[PDB]
Amino acid sequence: QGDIAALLIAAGADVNAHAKGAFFNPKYQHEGFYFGETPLALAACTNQPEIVQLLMEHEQTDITSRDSRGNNILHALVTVAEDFKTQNDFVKRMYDMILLRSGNWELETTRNN
Amino acid sequence: QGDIAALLIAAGADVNAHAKGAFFNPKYQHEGFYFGETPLALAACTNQPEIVQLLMEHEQTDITSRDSRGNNILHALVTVAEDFKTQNDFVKRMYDMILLRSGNWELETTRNNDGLTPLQLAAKMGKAEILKYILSREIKEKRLRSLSRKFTDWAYGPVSSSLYDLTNVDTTTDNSVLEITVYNTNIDNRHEMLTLEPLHTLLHMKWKKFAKHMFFLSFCFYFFYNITLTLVSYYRPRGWLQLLGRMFVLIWAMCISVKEGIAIFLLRPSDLQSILSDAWFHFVFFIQAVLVILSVFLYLFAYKEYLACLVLAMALGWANMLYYTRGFQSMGMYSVMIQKVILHDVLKFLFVYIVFLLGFGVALASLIEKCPKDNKDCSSYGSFSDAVLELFKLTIGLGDLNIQQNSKYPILFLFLLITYVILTFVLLLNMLIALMGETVENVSKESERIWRLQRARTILEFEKMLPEWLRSRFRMGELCKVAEDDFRLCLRINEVKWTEWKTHVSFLNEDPGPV
Amino acid sequence: TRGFQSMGMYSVMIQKVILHDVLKFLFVYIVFLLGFGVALASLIEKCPKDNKDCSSYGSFSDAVLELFKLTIGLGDLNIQQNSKYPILFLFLLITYVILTFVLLLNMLIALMG
Ligand code: NA
What we know:
This is part of a larger assembly, with three copies of chain A.
Chain A: H1 2-11, H2 39-45, H3 49-57, H4 73-80, H5 90-102
The structure holds sodium ion.
Sodium ion (NA) binds next to loops of chain B.
């Protein structure tokens, strides 16, 4: 819901909330879905470029935010990324879009736990 | 003629007429066309959705009408339905349209004169396309959702879990889709029908619960059965502590004989292919078991032929070990490869080889002079039996080739020997390897499904051996699929698909986390 | 053999052939080899006091050795053994040849292809 999410951010929604729940960090690949536990990464991993652009343009968004695993936005895309037969190369395009928006090597050189 | 039929209905045409003629109910598929003998089914089976919609909207139309066979509209579509290469999936679309219009489970649960539901009829007639749709059926539109067989309880992004209805697809009922699709003998697409989402997972879930342990337990009992049988036969006289092992073989042979005696009886094998594709191991196990019983019967009498039957039990008993190769994908696919190789190539090769073996055997032995009074072993091709034995050893590369036989035409005798080598060693033996490679390529792309089909037969047999109790290894319990007191036994399957990216508004539980 | 493309690709071909086909072939062959070894040695009468080498299938070890040589085409096939059922003894020998020489040995070449 891009239109609904757009007005929530203007209303004062926390764009840096971390979903540290058990479902968002599953031990396996069947009882949960890991995406980075952040709204910026959730839109990135769900093939929602419009929300990603809106979130990145926001001044309060922390692009270099680290989750419980220590993963940044780029790390979450790598884990989420799959083969071309499964994913329509949207992660690769999303990886380029987010990296260019930051325009720095800090995000690329970040190390997780 | 949709326009012509439209005014006929308004004029007072009977929309429930039954065409009970011989042509509309043919005995075969060439002298008639069966469609349900009703105008509602005729338009459905002839790909005429406009007439079907007009007929269904009519107040006098009886959707749940039954023909002489007891078939309803849904049954007629199942019989009419064919493969995708023949029919443009119009039956599947027509099946959905008619079922949604009725909006009730009465039509789906109706049984014909054979006591088969439309869901069961698809498995009985091997309609994989119809069975796939019904087993995995989701109705997105509201106001009618209990008719679905597939439900997604929760979904979060690409990860979602699906629940497949198992009220009529399980071993709990007397006759179900799973039982039919495995024990069917009138269809040749069972391995394709077992690849469906609910059927494939249901077999896998029960395989790892009880079937895996019972299969290993059966192997251990049979392995010890042959080990003990081999030792007593090999170490036979030519005591008081090892007597328990000897009684085990006799008792276990009776158990196999009784179990295989009824298993073949209830299977009702009619076609030759069914023997080699569904009951080959039901006979050789029975034959091996009765040979031990026969040997014991002859042992207590004065007949010395008990040893001959005892040896046959040993050779056949160890040969029966290849049945237990299933359960393992690598060994199971290897075993099903042997069956195709034997029937397609080995049996065909042996028939021609014997003709050449026996054909040259009489010829070579014909031009053999009688041995002199001094040397009585002048020629190794003395008789027909000797000639075949020498040629048989020649084919397998054993012994020495002595062409200095007592033949009155040594050049002619050698000419036939070289011809036999070219026909057998060069032509028949070498071509068999090439021919099997063609069959290996054709089977390797489908041998995996065949092994699962053979393995699935074992799962059902083991489950039937279970008593009335101990049946606590079923699937997930009752789930509130619909708030109107609709609880169904469902199987949970989780799938991930980064393709459509839809909005989940047709779920059962808001919370995605399992609980 | 690695370092050379021709020899290196040949070596990795051996590993797949051994695991996928050779090991699978040997397991079935041993069952037939040992299964017929006990059977053939079972119907062998004791040698007379005059000739102590009446039959080459004297024991289980001898029976397997003769069948092993039969599979590889070594020695001579002497069916005039001291068997109380020569027809049955020859029946198992021919069955072993069909199962091994005709079926198992030939199918291995096709499967590896
Ligand atoms: Na040789």
